[PDB]
């Protein structure tokens, strides 16, 4: 439920081996990042990290901000949040976007490479009709209810 | 023109990259120089 | 020993035939000094405008998708690029190192403006067009929004180059 | 230069702490040579002669003498270059991360470019050396998901027409079997003239504790290490033998001669890490830079390599 | 094209098969430390023993005739070699240069020991020899006087080399 975890930890770390050391929630951004890619950066409501965006309207007194969403109204993918500004760095969904996202908690197990993979209302990935978003690798379960996915979205389909 | 010679000191990019060339190559010599089995 | 170097003559020329630049050497030079209609060529890579800020994606290939749109599939090896259309379009492959046997993809979500492999010469100007199972543009279920800028140009028996616009996806 | 490039001047400054590669103990000093080039091919030749008949007695008057012929062979080894990419702090911008005990921002995961860069260069040399001692390149503990290489880069491992025993699964515990194996791998490996020569074979850390173990009744003052060595001892003319342990390697023994003409690593200068000058600036304090290497250049003789694989099915 | 590439390779065997000495690129060092039997190879030019006082003429020549017995074939251009026997025998080709089509031949009044081209495997010691319509020898109304001093070799599907001394022709 956050970018680092809140508790601390009472083990140094053993950097010896240089494989799987990938597969932790705090791993911000994409795998495969291009220097030509459109960043911006929002307030944000919730705690929308690794998980699709859509924009919240409140009473006019405040500016936009972003929320965990998908659906028809899906603005973008929320790659990186500063906690002390409230910040939540978006991907817009007119960009491509390859990288590790929050996977549904249901049928995680049926979730293989290459099967087509659409957001919830939650933002959440599942697998299928709107946005092209295709599985790259299996659920990794980083906590009993915490299951990421290796995912590339390259926009909306017909 | 190694990185190991604090005299070098370079005028570009490529001097640098020869420099740090030059100094694996002068580490790994060393190395093989100090090894024993 | 004839017929073996007729039969090696044939299959290099068929083999060359897909190939971005092959290497044929020849006994005389050309001449190419008027300075039009020198860029309809299969060796003219990349798009006839392009933008600092396009985003490429180099990937390795199966086949020869090269001016062909490619789809992205997975096998144990990384998942590959693959020339082919449909509603499994990922992006377009306008580059091809054959050494390194890489090729660079502009993403779907990306514009693109350049001559593209097309299926006969059978495409007029203002025309709508759809990427076929082979990655070939074939005149209009379009589920991207291409447009024809010129009409199909032949440089060999089934090479066909259209100058197309592809600017992303309907709805 | 220096006085212009800040991030040059840190990675002259930090390229001392990088530690050497662990490749370089499985090689003889001899046997490396570098070359001149980034990416493409190169091309050797070696030439062999040959005696076309019995030799003529030099008696009295005569013309008519033997020959000694000549032949060649040409071998093409491919490189390849590869990059990647990490973030970082701007140099202006680290005074403003500054702290007592550490510099850069723990909640965000930004470090200065000297600390980023040294731990960048250590995870991509441990990269070259798994992917010196397999052929292979992934990031996966499973070893699946592959980036496919060019023809003619193999590793030791890899390398296509060497000696390979398969030791069953149902005798992975028997130390007997395994010898039987290592032997009939030994009998079946082809070394020439040149099989005076020290050898040398890298194990995983589970056959090496299965090795230590003493030498089988049972007995005593004798190890299975011993015994291999003198079964290596057999056939390399009584030389030297060296053992090695690598993580790396999973239920595998390697075996090889320590002999330039044999096996040779002619890898490029510029196959160890080094930096890009392109660096990625924007409005905000996060900077990119760039890393390179250099991979292939593996050169071996037919049949002179042993690889046993214990199957732990 | 995977298939285009596979009839390209076979086709190149079938041609470098037919060469003096093939140029391939090998993965590998190939090892032959052994001394002993390491000149039966197909690239042995010349003669197993060589008199400075021997006659060479090069031709132009049709076809394959390396390591076989020629004979003049006259046509506009000069006469050429072709490989062949019989009563026809002029000579026989030592040497071959594919690149400015120049084959290196011994005159049938000048004397040779050597590996040459023989027809099958059913060739012994101490064996009369004649060259057939394609300049094999074959064991035999022998026009010349060739005896076989050792037996065929085999190195390809076809190629069978046989040491043979040739001293001139019978009466």
Known sequence: LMKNPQQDSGLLSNSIDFRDQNLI????????????DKIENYPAKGYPYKRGVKLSFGDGTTELEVEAGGGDDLYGVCSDIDEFSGMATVIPITNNFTGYLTLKKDGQNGVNPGDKLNFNQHGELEKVKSVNAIALSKAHKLTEDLFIVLASVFGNRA | ASLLDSNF????????????????????????????? | TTQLVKEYQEKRSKLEKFMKNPQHDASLLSNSNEFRDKNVEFFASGGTRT???????????????????????????????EAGGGEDLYGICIDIDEFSKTATIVPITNNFEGYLVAKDSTVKVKDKLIFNKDGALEKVKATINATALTDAKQISNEVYLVKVAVFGNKA | LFD????????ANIIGEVKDPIMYKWFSPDQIEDVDLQMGYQKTVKWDAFLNANPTTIANEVNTI??????????????????????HLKQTSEKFYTSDSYIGDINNNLLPFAQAYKLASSEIIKLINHFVLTGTVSIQKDGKNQKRLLPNMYGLLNMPEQIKEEVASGDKDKMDKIFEKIEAGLSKLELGDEFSTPMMVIVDPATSLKLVKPYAAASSCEKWEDVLIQTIKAINNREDVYIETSNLLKHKILIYPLNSELIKFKPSKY?????????????????????????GGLLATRKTILQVNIKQS
């Open chain 3, 51 to 81: 933008s600092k800020f396009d985003k490429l994606e180099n990937h390795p290939f199966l086949g020869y998708p090269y001016k062909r749109g490619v789809k992205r599939v997975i096998q144990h090896y990384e998942p590959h690029v």
């Open chain 4, 66 to 87: 033997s020959t000694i012929g000549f032949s060649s062979e040409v071998v093409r080894l491919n490189y390849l270059k590869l990059q990647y990419k990490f973030r």
């Open chain 1, 25 to 36: 929630f705090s791993n911000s951004g994409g795998v495969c990042t291009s220097s030509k």
């Open chain 4, 4 to 11: 212009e490039n800040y991030y040059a001047k840190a990675v």
């Open chain 4, 271 to 295: 196959m160890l890490p080094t930096p890009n000058e392109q660096v990625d600036k924007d409005s905000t304090d996060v900077a990119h830079s760039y890393i390179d290497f250099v991979l």
């Open chain 2, 9 to 37: 000191v370079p005028i570009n990019f490529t001097e640098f990259v020869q420099a740090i060339s030059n100094t694996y190559k002068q580490r790994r010599i060393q190395f093989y120089e100090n090894l024993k089995r």
